[PDB]
Ligand binder design. Structure first.
Ligand SMILES: *C(=C)Cn1c(C)c(-n2nnc3ccccc32)c(=O)n(-c2cncc3ccccc23)c1=O
Ligand SMILES: *C(=C)Cn1c(C)c(-n2nnc3ccccc32)c(=O)n(-c2cncc3ccccc23)c1=O
Lengths: 305, 305
């Protein structure tokens, strides 16, 4: 049946992307009901990003200093406030294309789709995962702030990420839709350490279950392992410690393929110690960890919205 | 800045996906203006797919035998015809969400975004490429026929692919929006050979240019090569022969990075003969060939729609 990195249909999010201009800085905004959400660093100049006093910079700003554009239509700003690191511009008009939505703070290891935008216009969509160090490895250029990450549950759009900065190491950092950064990052142009990134172990196991479903079974060995001895090989190769909760989520994948979770950990343990010897799994020559067990079930069952 | 497999915003295509039912078979349809396009094998039973006489099977079908559903709204079928391998159901109502569109028959090696649909409801979106053997390696389950592949040029949606069958080897085959199959495939449940698949050489070179832009420069060597001697290493490793046209398209990538195309072919020649030695390029341990030179420029410049 095949297996691909798949993103949610971005139709419901395209109708909410607007362009926000404050002075010379222009970035993307998210228009839901009569409130426009955008990163608060839109009020900063190129020289202000070094050490910005956001409370002092926002004081010098009025309602008419914010230009919100939805296509060719201008939105009247009648209120502004700063919640953590996001700016909330109250507009006089509710977005007629507002879908059913919620604000959700996802956990490290979970995945979401990103709609990369520039000047309020969508450019592309791709699937990513929140690394354990609360960073993401996306595709972001200059002007891509304001771009949101989201999950879709049938009719509801769960917004979970807003892009803010590109770290000097090349990775990306951002906040939730309430302004709280993911990780120890601040909206300030300074050298910030992301920390040791590790591999989402439960996502790797789910990806191996998807390989068996699609006929890729060459890595299945003749061993088992304990939950304690497996996390030992995991901690050596910079892998997340596997917990009983992770085993519980892998239940449906273990029952569909008839392979016990502990047996799958043994095949993964052998792959960590012996490598792939040049072979591939689902068209990849490395261990992919950007598919949650829920993503594997969705793609191997055809869940629509 | 990062590099990711990126798909076009599927908002304009979501508004055209409908569900078509003929007897017991149900698949997806594409609703543009007052015409619904769907694969013609919707008129076949499970036992009819072995050796179907489509001209004889369609004769036993009337206008009222086709149930077209756009959400919860029924469409009145007032005309039907068979163009090659697609069925064109004329409806009494033009789609109010019809975007500017064209029908395009793409060439092998070019890429396009796929919106996987089930029962007329979109489920996901992903980028793929038309392999030189006119197959695609997508993610398709039962009921995913009717799913279309498309490219977006600012305001125009260029439809280029409609999914029809999954070959016994696991790959997928389909037609253009006029019904002409890509390759020597027929809409018949029989064993069909896809042929020797090869690697899109111009796409691999463009992917290496994207690596240098993003800072991945470890594969740059100290050699050059001729266009004749390079296609010799290419023909040995099942790679497409590089032509002067391919070199012309790689012009902007060669001028942006300051690396001649023939010099990039030498680094690629060394990678084919020596492998990667365990290293990675843009987070991949193999040579990716699903990025056209136009896809690299779009993602490394931020082209929006
Ligand atoms: C957003 C519209 C502009 N932009 C900014 C302002 C920044 N940026 N520079 N220093 C900063 C400190 C704190 C927060 C943001 C910030 C930025 O990094 N990027 C940005 C984001 N992602 C990728 C990227 C790639 C190349 C240049 C900039 C850039 C901004 O877009
Ligand atoms: C489409 C809604 C149903 N479907 C069909 C009918 C077929 N299929 N079986 N034999 C065939 C011969 C010629 C054309 C189609 C055809 C089919 O293959 N698939 C299908 C397509 N992609 C992936 C896939 C995965 C698992 C089962 C079927 C399947 C159909 O969906």
């Amino acid at each position: 049946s095949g297996f691909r990195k798949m993103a949610f249909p971005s139709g419901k999010v395209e109708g909410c992307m607007v362009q926000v201009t404050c002075g010379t800085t222009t970035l993307n905004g998210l228009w839901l009901d009569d409130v426009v959400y955008c990163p608060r660093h839109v009020i900063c100049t190129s020289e202000d990003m070094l050490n910005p006093n956001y409370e002092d910079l926002l004081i010098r700003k009025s309602n008419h200093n914010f230009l919100v554009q939805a296509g060719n239509v201008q939105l009247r700003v009648i209120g502004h406030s700063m919640q953590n690191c996001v700016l909330k511009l109250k507009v006089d008009t509710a977005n007629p294309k507002t879908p059913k939505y919620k604000f959700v703070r996802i956990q490290p290891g979970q995945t979401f789709s990103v709609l990369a935008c520039y000047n309020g216009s969508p450019s592309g969509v791709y699937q990513c995962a929140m690394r354990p160090n609360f960073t993401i490895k996306g595709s972001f250029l200059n002007g891509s702030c304001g771009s949101v990450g989201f999950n879709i549950d049938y009719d509801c759009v769960s917004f979970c990420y807003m892009h803010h900065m590109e770290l000097p190491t090349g990775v990306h950092a951002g906040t939730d839709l309430e302004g709280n950064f993911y990780g120890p990052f601040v909206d300030r142009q300074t050298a910030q350490a992301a920390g040791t990134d590790t591999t989402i172990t439960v996502n790797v196991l789910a990806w191996l279950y998807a390989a068996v479903i699609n006929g890729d079974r060459w890595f299945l060995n003749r061993f088992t392992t304990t939950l304690n001895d497996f996390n030992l090989v995991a901690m050596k190769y910079n892998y997340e410690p596997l917990t009983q909760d992770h085993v519980d989520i892998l239940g449906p994948l273990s029952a569909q393929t008839g392979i016990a979770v502990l047996d799958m950990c043994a095949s993964l343990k052998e792959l960590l110690q012996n490598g792939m010897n040049g072979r591939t799994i689902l068209g990849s020559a490395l261990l992919e960890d950007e598919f949650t067990p829920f993503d594997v079930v969705r793609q191997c069952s055809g869940v629509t919205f």
